[PDB]
Design a binder for this molecule. Structure first.
Ligand SMILES: Nc1nc2c(ncn2[C@@H]2O[C@H](COP(=O)(O)OP(=O)(O)NP(=O)(O)O)[C@@H](O)[C@H]2O)c(=O)[nH]1
Ligand SMILES: [Mg+2]
Length: 183
């Protein structure tokens, strides 16, 4: 047959690491240094569970200024990654306050993966200490999983675009959430 075409849209607050996640996955290199994007397209031709897939990846802008344009990326979405940074509690709460409602509205009845980004920073002695000074604490795995279940996500996954810990898994699971498994 042909590789199954699967459209995956990536959303979440500005600076949670959406573009880095995509560039790290598709090229194996982490981009130079930060810079907001305005809807870039990426792709991956891969095997998952013995099936070839053409994964089309749609990056989106997290900033509020791009709210009116973001919806143009949603038609025909097969799976959505809702991203939050593990070291930004606000970005976590925005999963329920903003991103889930937006995705559910524009992409009803398609799978969602919840992605906790910047896993390397949850492990950063410094970063922790620094969050502490601000009365913040990183989001834990159980906390993340609970958000996932609240929003009906098929999976909760944690990763670092920088170290690539758990990176491949995010995309294999986004594809698995779409494919029809064996009998
Ligand atoms: N430590 C660390 N930093 C990361 C990781 N991923 C992205 N970052 C950093 O976080 C910042 C934002 O990343 P970026 O991918 O541009 O975020 P975005 O979600 O695409 N922002 P926007 O919605 O504005 O386009 C950059 O400084 C980038 O280096 C990570 O896995 N670990
Ligand atoms: Mg970006």
């Amino acid at each position: 047959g042909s590789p199954q075409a699967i459209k995956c849209v990536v959303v979440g607050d500005g600076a949670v690491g959406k573009t880095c996640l995509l560039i790290s996955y598709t090229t194996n290199a982490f981009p130079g240094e930060y810079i907001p994007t305005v809807f870039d397209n990426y792709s991956a031709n891969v095997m998952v569970d013995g099936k070839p897939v053409n994964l089309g990846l749609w990056d989106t802008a997290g900033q509020e200024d791009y709210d009116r344009l973001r919806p143009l990326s949603y038609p025909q979405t097969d799976v959505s990654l809702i991203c939050f940074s593990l070291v930004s509690p606000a970005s976590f709460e925005n999963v329920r306050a903003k991103w889930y409602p937006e995705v559910r509205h524009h992409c009803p009845n398609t799978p969602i993966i919840l992605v906790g980004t910047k896993l390397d920073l949850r492990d950063d002695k410094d970063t922790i200490e620094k969050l502490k000074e601000k009365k913040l604490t990183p989001i834990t795995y159980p906390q993340g999983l609970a958000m996932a279940k609240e929003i009906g996500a098929v999976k909760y996954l944690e990763c670092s675009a920088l170290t690539q810990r758990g990176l491949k898994t995010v995309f294999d699971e986004a594809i698995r959430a779409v494919l029809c498994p064996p009998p």
